[PDB]
Amino acid sequence: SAIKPDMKIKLRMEGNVNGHHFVIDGDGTGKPFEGKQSMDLEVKEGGPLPFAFDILTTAFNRVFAKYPDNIQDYFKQSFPKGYSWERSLTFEDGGICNARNDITMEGDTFYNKVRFYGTNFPANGPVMQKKTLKWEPSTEKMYVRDGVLTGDVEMALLLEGNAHYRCDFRTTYKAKEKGVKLPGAHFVDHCIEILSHDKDYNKVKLYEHAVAHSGL
């Protein structure tokens, strides 16, 4: 009821990957109940980025996920006050990232304050050499670990040369308001796509479709 069927999205990301500093702005719309969102991104500082845009893209809100009536929707119940998440990304060649987002809502707009820090990417690796093509579609497993709603996902970045480059996501999610009830364990299928880009990925349009389910 706080959440409307059509919502706007405003975003700023600040960050640092292998010592390279950057600022990216986002402006988007989505449909919370249909699990669908898209966003226009614009690098404001630090471009052209010297690393694969793709590592960033899952950091640019689990409110945009279609929940059936039989799974508690922790994210939609967190509003208007909102919620935050923190995520670790562990890549198979030793690259590591920590991201966080603090999400708030004013009227019909979600505001997102995002931080992204990456380190230990090898200079000869697919991320620093810009050899990535896309994330494969994924299934996040949602469960409770020590009172905290936790999502794990085994992700795969398709590289040039038909190889995959693997990484493990762990995200913890916390409602701002005390006493929003935790859900039971469940799944969310995701698909994320770059729809269009310019030469150095200074402008990117992004799309995500997500659906919650009980595994059947």
Q: Torsions phi, psi of 140, nearest 5?
A: -85, 130
Rounded Cα distance, 168 and 196, in Å: 26
Strand extents, DSSP E, the chain: 7-17, 20-31, 36-45, 83-91, 96-106, 109-119, 132-135, 138-145, 148-159, 163-175, 186-197, 203-213
Technique employed here was: X-ray
Rounded Cα distance, 44 and 164, in Å: 30
Specify the 3-state DSSP secondary structure of 179.
coil
Rounded Cα distance, 94 and 149, in Å: 26
Could you state, in order of their start, the residue ranges of all structural domains in the chain? 1-216
Rounded Cα distance, 127 and 52, in Å: 5
Degrees (nearest 5) of the Cα angle 92, 58, 213?
Answer: 100
Instruction: Using alpha carbons, select from 172, 14, 148 the residue that is nearest to residue 87.
Output: 172
How is 46-70 classified by DSSP, letter by letter?
A: SPSPSS-GGGGTTT--TTSSB--TT
Interrupted backbone of the chain, residues before each interruption (C–N > 2.5 Å)? 60
Contacts of 90 (CB under 8 A, 6+ apart): 96, 167, 168
Rounded Cα distance, 108 and 104, in Å: 11
Q: Are 60 and 92 in contact (CB under 8 A)?
A: no
Q: Are 115 and 100 in contact (CB under 8 A)?
A: yes
Resolution in A: 1.9
